[PDB]
Every structure is written in C-alpha cells, then in structure tokens.
Ligand binder design. Structure first.
Ligand SMILES: [Cl-]
Length: 177
C-alpha cells in the first residue's frame, strides 16, 4: 500500500536529516504526508524536525496529530512530553510522561523527565520519587544524582543531598579513568 511517491520522499527526508538540515527535511516530510495521509510516520518525523529547529509549540501540534491517529504511539508521547517540559508547560507534561513510564517502566530517562516535570509543578516530593527511580534504573548517570541532590537541598535534607553530590564527583573522577 505504500506509494512510489511516498518512498521517494521518505528517502530524500532521510538524507536531509542525515546532512543535519531539518529545515529542508520538513518540506519533503510534508510531501510524504500529502501522499500517504493517515500514515502516522511522516507526521512523527515532522515532529522531530520541528523540535530540533526549536519550533516547540508547532512540534506539540504535530505530535498530537500522530497521537490522534495512534493513541498509544509511545515515542510520540515521549517526545511530546519532552518538549512540553522544555516549554515549561509542566502540568500538561505530567500525564504524558506518566503514560510513557507505564509503557516503559525501566526507561530511566522517562522517569528523569517525569521528575523534572513534577519538580517544575512544585510537587517536590513526587519529583524526588521519580528521580529516585531514574537513579536506581541507571546509577552511573551523573545528571540524575545532580538533580536528586538539589531536590534534597530544596527540602532541607542536606545529609541525603551530600550523599548524592559526593557520588556526583566520584562519577566525575571516574570519567577521566
Ligand atoms: Cl533540580
């Protein structure tokens, strides 16, 4: 069922993304979409390009189109959640990211973005919960110890904050050796 036209445009879109030129890639992803309408994949790709170009509000709108077509499109929720966070729309990113983690309950990064969303919404305790899951799921990652440390600072538990920051540095000494 995939047209020759659709194949051509996909092919050109990929070269344009692979030569780091998403401005051009967009023009051709829109063509793929024109021909295979209701294929969510070109829309999903448009979303990615739009997010690299930093037109975040437009990227959310396209990710919503793909989610209207495939309500459980798990990557489409992931990336929507991740730009909703960058935009600082924390309240609206929370249900999205919480759905990603239900699909992918060992994805450390999902839980990190979730913690940052909760933290931004002044749900400090739920932010700590989530970041703690990310640290347990990937204890070598430095970012997750950094944030968990500061979250503990904000709650005036300077003991547990210290613990995490000491670990932050052990990781840093260990990335030269
Ligand atoms: Cl933080």
């Amino acid at each position: 069922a995939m047209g020759d036209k659709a194949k051509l445009f996909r092919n050109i879109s990929q070269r344009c993304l692979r030569r780091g030129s998403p401005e051009e890639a967009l023009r051709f992803l829109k063509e793929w979409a024109r021909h295979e309408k209701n294929d969510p994949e070109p829309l999903y790709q448009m979303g990615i390009a739009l997010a690299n170009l930093g037109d975040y509000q437009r990227a959310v709108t396209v990710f919503d189109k793909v989610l209207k077509l495939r309500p459980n499109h798990f990557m489409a929720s992931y990336r929507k959640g991740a730009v909703l966070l960058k935009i600082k729309q924390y309240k609206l990113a929370l249900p999205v990211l919480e759905a990603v983690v239900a699909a992918a309950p060992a994805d450390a990064r999902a839980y990190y973005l979730l913690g940052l969303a909760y933290d931004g919404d002044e749900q400090l305790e739920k932010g700590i919960e989530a970041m703690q899951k990310a640290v347990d799921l990937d204890p070598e990652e430095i970012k997750y110890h950094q944030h968990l440390g500061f979250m503990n600072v904000r709650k005036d538990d300077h003991k547990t904050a210290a613990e995490h920051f000491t670990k932050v540095m052990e990781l840093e000494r260990s990335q030269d050796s």
